[PDB]
């Protein structure tokens, strides 16, 4: 056949992550330094809330999503596929499919939320990447990301003053977690802890 | 720094790059469109395709190395070359995940924007993207394999009356190509006179063998 | 310099690395060993087996992070851990093509020196496993080892249980003829020394999972 | 079953090279700086002669092998798999299988040849890597290695007389090649008249462009 030939060229880059391992997917904004030219400083409230709604939507549509952390213009999502013994994988851990769909989902909701408040704003695009992490390295990832949060935070505030203790999401970002009330829901945790002081906040979704 | 170096190695473990100076094909297919096209008209919705055609142009405009964009059903195939000269650079330096995700993202934002207008309240449409490389002699055969699947889907959609009288886009899908016009220049435009590539192979190979 | 950078980009396109701090398994199967073992005894050749046992030792003595080397038929599996400490380095920095080739190269180098008393060649592949699957791997190889052994004895001269039922006691046969064999580091006294030994009393991993899990969990 | 799940982990690193494309395989000696301690300087005949035979054995067993180039302790091999429309790739372009069996092949033979003259010599080991190249670069690759071989040749010769030339044979100056020779029988022989590729581009491209 010729479909066998063409599909063969395709499969040469059909990469699959090994299963039963933590999966972290990061979605950073594409050229947001130009996109946030009209946004306010040091932090834009409307811009931050757009991510929060976007993070929920991602968590609501991604199989195995347990935790979503937001900062600056990036979104990181912890995905587990070893909850039970027969737990299925999202797209069978198809590397390209995970990175693209997540980016696509984060692109759809973010735009539709932003355009409601800003109908003249240009389209916003996102890049996505996937990776695996050993269990003992999952908490260290979000710590490393949160240390990047605070560093960027103090740099953004000091840039206004010359060339004390801001709110939570302005200091170390926030997370979107599962909440119970018996039904399940995702909600923005404004009381986000410093992960280095409360590692179990992440590890509760890692070791299970 | 120290902790960032360790984390980067895990990330770089799946930092795959496509080899340079080779034809690149990015296919962007719509996720769960069988559910999404519930309200759309059968067998051919002119507004459904027009939203794709507006997206195809958007993709070709922003994707570095874009030469041709063939549309069919719910999928979009983009041909990319990075060997136009010796100083030619690749899109995102041929980062596999980045090309696949940015493309699927660009396709998503433009499609929803067009569809939102004149259809208020429609559910969000999403896309998945994949990248690959092809030897020059196989590039034409890729589109033929795609143009053949189009006609297969076309006649099967008509069934569930002359088929050959139907428009070229309903029968064989429609490519979009950079057209040259005079004003005061280049311009991406939809080719409604899209030929049967199996017959006219140079229609695609013209961008391949540069 | 400039040209070299260009070529390297093509080469680096397939410089793939396994994620670190994760159990790495390397399997080395023989190439065309059906032809190679023509002069060898059936169902089992003692001289052919002992060569692998020396090869497994040679490998373990040289693979950085090697903890367990299981032998069976014409295959050689090796458990490699790189998370023993906090500053534990990875063999070749987990370069996939490298550890797959140097392994096969090593096994080739020794297996020919021993047997020279044609040429045998090998293939090598590497992968990572989650901690709770390492045990299941060697079990899978060991269970496969038994099936081949029962099917080999029955031959000269349907299901595996049916063949065992008919056929000369099979359980009377030694361990290596039954469920393959492992080689591990043993600690002995000759005055507190250490060496890689061929564990002739290799347990059924399905029964004794800790036999392998001791190398997976610190 | 458990067998299906286990093969799944394995398949996660069962990488395949794209087909209909030049495949270059490089085989380099592992820590030969130690192995060649007993060997002469700057150019050891018996060491190089062992590689020449190894290059024969490699080309005699690699499906699609066209050209083999020897330098220092490395061995490069050009592999095409598009000579015909039905040409099959070696090991179906399995990256790990190509890389490993190649190095295993080299190791098995190199130790056999070297043992004839040096029975006291320790075991030699090789590492193998595999890649693909667009046709434009195949000649360039071998030039890159050959220009590298020339640099080292001049420097190493300069080591013996001063601390810190064209009269020397070809292999001591710019390495050597192994091509299939026709005499109607065929055989892989050592081209002792191996040209400077940068001048004779067709010497390599003749296997590339078919
Ligand atoms: C650190 O980590 C932040 C996120 O890293 P990346 O997403 O890799 O940013 P980058 O430098 O553009 O790297 P790429 O996205 O791969 O091109 C920034 C700085
Ligand atoms: N004013 C304002 N700018 C922000 C805010 N959050 C993110 N940004 C902008 O987003 C950028 C984040 O860093 P990057 O993601 O590396 O910037 P980039 O130009 O998008 O680079 P790429 O991610 O590679 O596209 C910063 O430079 C800021 O200018 C915000 O809350 N307010
Ligand atoms: N009404 C209408 N439906 C279409 C049109 N084009 C494609 N479709 C629908 O899209 C489907 C194409 O098959 P798929 O691409 O596999 O549909 P899918 O649900 O997106 O499945 P995935 O490819 O896995 O994402 C067909 O079954 C059609 O029902 C169109 O032009 N008009
Ligand atoms: N220009 C350039 N040359 C390199 C680079 N890396 C290695 N080389 C040279 O290219 C030659 C090819 O031999 P290799 O075995 O691939 O080099 P290497 O440094 O050992 O690379 P590894 O074996 O993967 O560790 C070596 O002699 C190096 O000196 C590079 O990144 N850029
Ligand atoms: N007579 C005999 N043959 C053996 C013995 N051990 C292994 N073999 C041979 O080794 C083979 C093991 O299966 P494979 O590894 O698939 O054989 P292969 O020919 O190397 O196939 P590939 O691995 O794909 O190259 C059997 O077919 C046997 O013929 C032995 O102890 N005695
Ligand atoms: N359950 C299961 N078993 C498999 C599968 N593939 C291979 N096996 C068995 O597992 C054993 C592993 O041997 P391999 O080295 O992979 O031999 P192979 O099947 O030729 O694989 P390659 O040499 O890479 O082509 C084989 O003897 C097969 O009988 C699979 O997909 N599922
Ligand atoms: N005496 C002698 N030594 C040689 C000759 N050719 C190569 N060598 C040795 O082979 C070595 C090749 O160096 P590299 O390939 O860059 O690295 P390596 O020493 O093999 O170590 P690795 O590549 O990391 O395994 C040189 O350092 C030389 O010492 C030769 O003709 N005569
Ligand atoms: Mg980025
Ligand atoms: Mg950004
Ligand atoms: Mg950022
Ligand atoms: Mg679809
Ligand atoms: Mg489709
Ligand atoms: Mg076998
Ligand atoms: Mg096999
Ligand atoms: Mg074998
Ligand atoms: Mg090297
Ligand atoms: Mg070397
Ligand atoms: Mg070398």
Author numbering:
A (entry chain C): 3 to 165, 190 to 207, 213 to 239
B (entry chain D): 2 to 161, 187 to 210, 214 to 239
C (entry chain B): 2 to 118, 124 to 163, 172 to 181, 187 to 210, 213 to 239
D (entry chain A): 3 to 166, 189 to 207, 213 to 239
The article reads:
The tRNAHis guanylyltransferase (Thg1) family comprises enzymes from all three domains of life, all of which catalyze reverse addition (3′–5′) of nucleotides to polynucleotide substrates. Here we report the first crystal structure of any TLP, that of the gram-positive soil bacterium Bacillus thuringiensis (BtTLP). In contrast to eukaryotic Thg1 enzymes, TLP enzymes prefer to catalyze repair of tRNAs with damaged 5′-ends, making them well-suited to participating in tRNA quality control pathways in vivo.
In the BtTLP/GTP complex a GTP molecule is observed in the activation site for all four monomers, bound in a similar orientation to the dGTP nucleotide in the hTHG1/dGTP complex. In the BtTLP/GTP structure, however, there are additional contacts between T38 and the bound GTP, with main chain carbonyl-N2 and OG1-N3 interactions provided by this residue. Interestingly, K43 does not interact with the guanine base in the BtTLP GTP-bound structure, as there would likely be a steric clash between the lysine side chain and the exocyclic amine of the base. The α-phosphate forms a salt bridge with R28 and K99′ (of the adjacent monomer in the dimer). In the BtTLP structure, however, the carboxylate group of E12 participates in salt bridge interactions with two arginines, R28 and R131, both of which contact the triphosphate tail of the GTP in the nucleotide transfer site. In the BtTLP structure, however, the side chain of the third carboxylate, E76, is located roughly 4 Å away from the aliphatic chain of R28, a residue shown to be important in binding the incoming GTP molecule.
